[PDB]
Design an enzyme around this catalytic site. Structure first.
Site, short mmCIF file in Angstrom:
data_model
loop_
_atom_site.label_atom_id
_atom_site.label_comp_id
_atom_site.label_asym_id
_atom_site.label_seq_id
_atom_site.Cartn_x
_atom_site.Cartn_y
_atom_site.Cartn_z
N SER A 128 2.96 1.90 -0.92
CA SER A 128 4.01 2.66 -0.24
C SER A 128 3.66 2.99 1.22
O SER A 128 2.53 3.36 1.54
CB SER A 128 4.31 3.96 -0.99
OG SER A 128 5.27 4.74 -0.30
N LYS A 182 3.59 4.62 -9.13
CA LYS A 182 4.44 4.19 -8.00
C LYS A 182 5.94 4.38 -8.30
O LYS A 182 6.70 4.78 -7.43
CB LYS A 182 4.17 2.74 -7.62
CG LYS A 182 5.08 2.19 -6.52
CD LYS A 182 4.78 2.90 -5.21
CE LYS A 182 5.95 2.83 -4.23
NZ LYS A 182 6.54 1.47 -4.16
N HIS A 185 6.79 8.07 -8.03
CA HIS A 185 6.84 8.39 -6.60
C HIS A 185 8.23 8.06 -6.04
O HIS A 185 8.78 8.80 -5.22
CB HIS A 185 5.76 7.61 -5.83
CG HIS A 185 6.16 7.26 -4.43
ND1 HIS A 185 5.82 8.04 -3.34
CD2 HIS A 185 6.92 6.25 -3.95
CE1 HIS A 185 6.35 7.52 -2.25
NE2 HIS A 185 7.02 6.43 -2.59
N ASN A 186 8.78 6.94 -6.48
CA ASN A 186 10.08 6.49 -6.02
C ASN A 186 11.23 7.32 -6.60
O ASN A 186 12.27 7.49 -5.95
CB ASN A 186 10.27 5.00 -6.33
CG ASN A 186 9.69 4.07 -5.26
OD1 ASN A 186 10.04 2.90 -5.20
ND2 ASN A 186 8.82 4.59 -4.41
N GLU A 189 11.04 10.41 -4.56
CA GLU A 189 11.67 10.03 -3.31
C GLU A 189 13.18 10.22 -3.37
O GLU A 189 13.73 10.92 -2.54
CB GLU A 189 11.30 8.58 -2.99
CG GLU A 189 11.88 8.02 -1.74
CD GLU A 189 11.45 6.60 -1.54
OE1 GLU A 189 10.27 6.36 -1.24
OE2 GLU A 189 12.29 5.72 -1.72
#
Lengths: 476, 476
Positions: A128, A182, A185-186, A189
């Site tokens: 990222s 990951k 995290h998105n 986001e």
């Protein structure tokens, strides 16, 4: 031969990673499914740096030190399996495949176990930072074969972003764990972008602020508790004038895209039985936005409150309340994010490290913020912390937010400005702190139309209605 | 031989279906994976009715008229495939397998296409009503092989519940469509139970009503616009005294169960990109409720507003506002439900019939209500209606609800009573009626950290920023 690692997949992302590694004194072998991009890259930005090309797959493989470290930055799905399948025969036990793409973690779980069967080492890694994050220091979230970590550690931590001297890259955990983290995290986001957009919307349609005024508010908020990359770019976007002096952002078609990693978090939350409501709402809100023509039509027929010019008397109080609403909601979303991580650790049998994950999100990544440093700190102090909200710093933040949080929601409610993310965060908060929820009625209802049975509260256990037993009642 | 159909799987559910068919003048062959339950059933409740047993699978198959109609009411998953695999060889082309269990529709899509390959007819059918609904008239939602419908039509429509003379059973559509529609019914169900529980919670913790008082409110509401089975049983549950005169429901452990069909709808909504936010929140709220010990702990530390004894001055106005909040929210959830159905029809290429689906949900099923008759009516009038909210009856209901809906939400907000479902319904409503949403900023943000590009509003198209083209801006 000579090359610490090779990287296949020469999109802007991968090019910048190779460049980043080169600048940190690694010899990197660059390659692609095709050729034009290899020669072109060696001709321009890789020129005069420790970057060598390849012509064949066997050529690529031959140029790499032992154990061979093969990183892929290709489109997710079958193309990842394509490369893997044509690379495995050219490899020997202990060689390491690194998937750095945004792959869905069950795929990484699979590739890990399949490659493991052949004695090949696998690293599924989250990456990222975007184009420019890849060039100077991305967040890297490797997982897979633990025994591959000592071999990629120095490359990864050297090239990764730093937060207070510390690299934004630790070994995440086994199998698909790096890609899992990951993914989340998105999801997070999506949540932060939706929360920011709701603040903007309330100031615009309820407050009647100009974009420059809303930009200045984000300028101000970035100077405080909300200090973050997304608040910065929002501040920057809001003051950005089109070629005609009118705010460019007000000309953009309000239909959000999503490549997929965001819905995956909500789906996983559902699979795992965790109440990740805000990320859910953020994904659904993009789905709502896609429905542009249906909404134009809806806007002409469905009623709602008038927003008078004087709906906000006290602009300073309005803005101060909103800041607390945004901030408290964000704390909910992250608290939900780590509940997910907590349940996934437990269900999958992965030893996920909360401080390290927060560290890895502190810098390099899109969601980077001072707030994340405060999360690292909370988990350093108590790595067994069951919920973020039990940390004093976050508990105090949420206590201080109470009045501004509720006032902004009642205000959006009264005046008809959608606050899906603010609303779900408060509902979750108020539900989460309830010793007793109305799920007692839910259970009674179920036992009634389906004899699904129910448990008794231990403080209400009796002759009939015994503890730790499934009770059915004949309600009729 | 003699038997209009056979049914395998003699749980209470299937027994009552066989009984129901028998009473309607069908000869049914009863069978099970095992034996005890067949003999026992023939010995007791099937005695003196047109119900015959079986001993072998080949015996069962032999007792059935042509084309053979084999219904399964077994546990979902592999046991359904078990039976199918041992029945196919004992069958001939044009024979019909009916799965009446709560099977996940992609499984039914699969079984349909596999059986089709062998020239066997498949019906995946939703069944709803519970034990007593199966005995007197369930809702039946058959889909699969259209050419099987003329053969099961009379059995199905005869045994199904009636709503104003009309049977609650029409051919749903191809492949897994019957099970799909049954899934969505169960998602909607979750939504209605959560909405009801929120009304209860607000009256209990905010109003300070006794259960008998809340029971009487549901009594009153059932006499009006909210007339429905779930409101009836809730009314009934709330007045139900334990052996000690204290309300039994207040002793039940507030941790909701879910067998799965509910999360499936939210997941499918996510897969399809439809904003089915309320069902999502309903599923997440059960997930929240499961976390009993974490919530006890949370309740001791996290702050929130005091609820004073005089928070509700006007109890009549309070209750009247709440009714409109419950009712308007329910309209949102169903509007979302049919958006899902609309997108699934389109994505899967299934010709789903909105009036028929509403008809099938009017009676027999758990969500049965007068409200559903009003949905049938709206779609009879306009079967191409893009959203329920464009129907005058629902548009008027939602217009009338405005004040009570917002007031109840602001009230729960101000006093700290969780309203996930009420809140998401209003946020969705206010978002859905917005010509312009802040997804313009979302798109700008994305184009900024990822160069994902954006479209221009057609009314803002210019020299730069042309229509129908993907624009990237260098924001830095």
């Amino acid at each position: 031969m000579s090359a610490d690692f090779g990287l296949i997949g020469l999109a802007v992302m991968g090019q910048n990673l190779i460049l980043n590694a080169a600048d940190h004194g690694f010899t990197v072998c660059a390659y692609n499914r095709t050729q034009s991009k290899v020669d072109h890259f060696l001709a321009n930005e890789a020129k005069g740096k420790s970057i060598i090309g390849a012509t064949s797959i066997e050529d690529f493989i031959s140029k790499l030190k032992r154990p061979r470290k093969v990183m892929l930055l290709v489109k997710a799905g079958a193309p990842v399996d394509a490369l893997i399948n044509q690379i495995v025969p050219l490899l020997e036990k202990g060689d390491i495949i690194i998937d750095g793409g945004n792959s869905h973690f069950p795929d990484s779980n699979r590739r890990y176990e399949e490659l493991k069967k052949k004695g090949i080492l696998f690293v599924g890694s989250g990456v990222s930072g975007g184009e420019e994050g890849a060039r100077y220091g991305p967040s890297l979230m490797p997982g897979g074969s633990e025994e591959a970590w000592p071999h990629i550690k120095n490359i990864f931590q050297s090239i990764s972003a730093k937060s207070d001297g510390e690299p934004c890259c630790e070994w995440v955990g086994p199998a698909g764990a790096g890609h899992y983290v990951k993914m989340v995290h998105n999801g997070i986001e999506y949540g932060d972008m939706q929360l920011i957009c709701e603040a903007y919307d309330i100031m615009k349609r309820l407050g009647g602020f100009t974009d420059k005024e809303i930009s200045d508010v984000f300028a101000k908020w970035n100077n405080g508790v909300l200090d973050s990359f997304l608040v910065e770019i929002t501040r920057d976007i809001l003051k950005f004038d089109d070629v005609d002096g009118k705010p460019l952002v007000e000309k953009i078609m309000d239909t959000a895209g999503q490549k997929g990693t965001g819905k995956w978090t909500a789906i996983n939350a559902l699979d795992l039985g965790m109440p990740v409501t805000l990320i859910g709402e953020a994904v659904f809100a993009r789905c709502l936005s896609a429905l542009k023509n249906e909404r134009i039509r809806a806007s002409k027929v469905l009623p709602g409150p008038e927003v008078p010019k004087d709906a906000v008397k006290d602009r300073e109080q309005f803005v101060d309340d909103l800041e607390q609403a945004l901030y408290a909601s964000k704390i909910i979303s992250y608290a939900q994010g780590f509940m997910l991580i907590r349940e996934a650790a437990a269900t999958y049998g992965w030893k996920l490290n909360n401080p390290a994950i927060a560290l890895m999100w502190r810098g390099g990544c899109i969601i980077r913020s001072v707030f994340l440093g405060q999360i690292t700190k909370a988990y350093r102090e108590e790595p067994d912390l069951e919920n973020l909200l039990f940390n004093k710093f976050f508990a105090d933040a949420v206590t201080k937010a109470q009045s501004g949080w509720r006032k902004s929601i009642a205000l959006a409610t009264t005046y008809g400005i959608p606050t899906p993310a603010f609303s779900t965060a408060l509902s979750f908060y108020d539900g989460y702190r309830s010793e007793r929820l109305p799920a007692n009625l839910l259970q009674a209802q179920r036992d009634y139309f389906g004899a699904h049975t129910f448990r008794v509260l231990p403080e209400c256990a009796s002759d009939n209605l015994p503890v730790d037993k499934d009770i059915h009642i004949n309600w009729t």
